[PDB]
Design a protein around this nucleic acid. Sequence first.
DNA 1: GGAAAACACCCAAGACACCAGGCACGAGACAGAAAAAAACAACGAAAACGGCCACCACCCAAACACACCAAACAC
DNA 2: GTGTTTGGTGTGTTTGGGTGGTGGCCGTTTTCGTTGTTTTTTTCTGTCTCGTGCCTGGTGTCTTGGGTGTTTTCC
Lengths: 98, 103, 106, 90, 95, 92, 97, 83, 78
Amino acid sequence: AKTRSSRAGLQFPVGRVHRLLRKGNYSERVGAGAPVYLAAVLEYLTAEILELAGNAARDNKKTRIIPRHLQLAIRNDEELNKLLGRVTIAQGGVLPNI
Amino acid sequence: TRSSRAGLQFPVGRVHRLLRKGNYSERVGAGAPVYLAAVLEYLTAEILELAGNAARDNKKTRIIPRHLQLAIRNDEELNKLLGRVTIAQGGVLPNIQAVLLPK
Amino acid sequence: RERACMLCGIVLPGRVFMQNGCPNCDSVLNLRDSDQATVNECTSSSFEGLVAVGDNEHSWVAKWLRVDRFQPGLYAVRVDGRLPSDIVAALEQYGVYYRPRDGSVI
Amino acid sequence: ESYSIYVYKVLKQVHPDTGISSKAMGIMNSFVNDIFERIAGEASRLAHYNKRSTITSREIQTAVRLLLPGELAKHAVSEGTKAVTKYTSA
Amino acid sequence: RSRKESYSIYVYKVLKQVHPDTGISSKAMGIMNSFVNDIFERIAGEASRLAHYNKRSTITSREIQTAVRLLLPGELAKHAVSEGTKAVTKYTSAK
Amino acid sequence: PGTVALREIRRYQKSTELLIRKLPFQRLVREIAQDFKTDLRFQSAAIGALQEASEAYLVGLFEDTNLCAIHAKRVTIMPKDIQLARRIRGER
Amino acid sequence: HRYRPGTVALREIRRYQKSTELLIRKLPFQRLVREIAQDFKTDLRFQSAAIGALQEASEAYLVGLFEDTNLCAIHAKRVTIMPKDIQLARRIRGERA
Amino acid sequence: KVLRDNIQGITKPAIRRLARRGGVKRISGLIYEETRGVLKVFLENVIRDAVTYTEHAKRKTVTAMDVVYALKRQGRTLYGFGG
Amino acid sequence: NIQGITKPAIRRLARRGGVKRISGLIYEETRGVLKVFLENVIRDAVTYTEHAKRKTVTAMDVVYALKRQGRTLYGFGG
DNA sequence: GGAAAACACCCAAGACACCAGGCACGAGACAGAAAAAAACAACGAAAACGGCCACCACCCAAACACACCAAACAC
DNA sequence: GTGTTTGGTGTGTTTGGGTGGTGGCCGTTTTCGTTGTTTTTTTCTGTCTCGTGCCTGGTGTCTTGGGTGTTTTCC
Ligand SMILES: [Zn+2]
């Protein structure tokens, strides 16, 4: 298992996250599991969002996810919308709410 | 000292060291700390001028947090700059709404 | 890339169906107002027998293909795939009877 | 650089019969970059708060605790600890 | 012992420069120290973000000036830019 | 009176398309930018992002204005509701 | 004699927009802070300055909220603040969803 | 060529559409001007920053990233256009 | 311990906030809002404390937690 | 806060017209890249005074006691 | 109004501890050349932004009707 992703069972690039941690001016040194931990969290969060985006694209009888479904997924989830309350989504529209 | 050379009262060496040790950029040019010390000195001078005015208005010779709060919330540009900060023991400006005043 | 609208039998590019919808079936299908899944379920790119109709009123072929009340253009003798059960029920709600053009029903 | 192939990987892992538009991938890339910036900035802020010059997984864990809300934080912490534990084991 | 730095003496110098017959409480000196630290942090963060946006390794007076321009309101920004340019030119002309 | 308004509400909440016309908005943006630097060029994506942000902002503001107007036990939004909303939001 | 209801209220408003002293009893607030904190970790100690900062921030927040509440109440053409006024103000700030 | 008073290119039906998407049922005739001013003050605040970025990069073209940074600076993070 | 915030104290805070008349449910509403606010701030502070591996909650932890929310406070050592 | 009057604001329906919009082509400023070229920032070092800590003494205004003032509400 | 009379601002003498100033020292800014590279500089390519032009009709909009929902009034 040459890749750090395989060694961790991940899909995101551990090496790019490490590179970004170093060439990003956050600290003089970086651990060895800090990039791994952050990549795991990021992959989990993207999967979490993609779950609801797939749900929303399937609720609109659509096979492809578009910005509308990402907007719906984010603005319909209590925790994601609290996390992402100050983020504008392009072509996301609004939620039908009368 | 580098403050005298620039006709300043704020420290240039201290500010340069804080910029250097703050992980802000790989390197720091030499015209940034002089400029920043001048800006900070100007802003503190403005604050202290208005706070001294506010303390004299109350006929006091020493600035307390109340005068800082009054000076900040009374100046439009500063109040826009310090719009989210709360000052401990600063109070509020005296402000009674028009409709609550007696008739 | 061209697809054949299952209901009326017209053949137009799939992107045209998505962007503008069926000029004839929009009164009952709302193809433009429908997602890609519904567009595929009502417009199929797999078909046979390209047909060009000039005058719907007097063409016996158009009457034989039941397209004499539609816009002249590209039409397909046989279209692969049928309308879904939910869309069939929705059309039956409107009072319109759907006759498949797949050839398996005659 | 973009996270598009990784989002495809995650999507097919999660939703084999769903596809993503170009704009939705742009949004996802913006989201990933934004979250990385937030978390890394908070980790640096913590390191400075505690007079440290290294970002270790503890700083990242408590940064995730600060940023994410309760249940989200709990699940993300579990995911990160699982991944770090298995990377250490391997 | 604990030789920790602050801006108290500089705040006092500025006070005696603007208001000779006015003192300052310790709590107000604390507020002024917190204010100085805050403004430093804001300006340095903006300058860092700008340098990294423009792919530069150096924080010069241009970055500081444009962060000041972005951050302060019209008259305040104008006076601050005047002050900074004056000080920079006075510092550079001498040595 | 009152049905087509609900139909328009429903329609526009179902959609995402920008509501301000693109070229009048482009010219307005150029006119405003003409104060900050003379004879500027603009990327198209810059104008698109600006229009998306402006419409999102205005829609949120209209949401808050409707909330205030309903609070006042009304149904018609008036400029003082917008003013109250911008005051409470902390806008200058 | 007797004052109209609201005259002593305005005298108090003038008195309290002038002063800066904390309007909550300190010990109840300290006990409340420890009770709340005890739901995250038992046997916690607090420097007195931490409680002071918490009390200052909480009162400052509440006063700003009361200002917004007054704005809402006067907008509705009323004078008495109500829980619905608070809920509307907290929603409009972006504090309540 | 100089642009003069193009705020009225935000037609009244456009403002009505923005209000309807916002959930407004009955719109006062003075709203449209209110809104117009508000939008002006917003755009003037965003553009002033975007231009500030463009001039600091010693450029002559306003890029999409300049807009993205100006919005990010105001807490207006925008997904879809970069970030 | 939330009833230690008596009605007169909430009245004092509303009067400094300019409130002339007060309903009867405002007191419970204010207790709930304050509890939520304090909960958030203390959650952040306790997170900071646990991370710093301490058993005492300092004023710096509160100040960083308020800086996290955006409620910057001057005069406590910042 | 509820009930009551009522009026005119805003929407709604309609026809007329504009210019946005759509597309195109042309031109080229300026952006992106490349190659060149140097002063500037970092490094070590030595260097000296400013800024820190201690400690001292004075007087602003905190405090307590008097008073005139001038709004409050009663009449 | 007319009136007494509660509220609040102005005034004075008294206390003191915290503001201010001054001595001692140590550590951090300072002056400095060299190193090395991030800049600046110049020159070149070429995309896309500006620039303009035509035609269509989606859209903008001017206006009559009018009703409902806002503002006021009484209790
Ligand atoms: Zn059809």
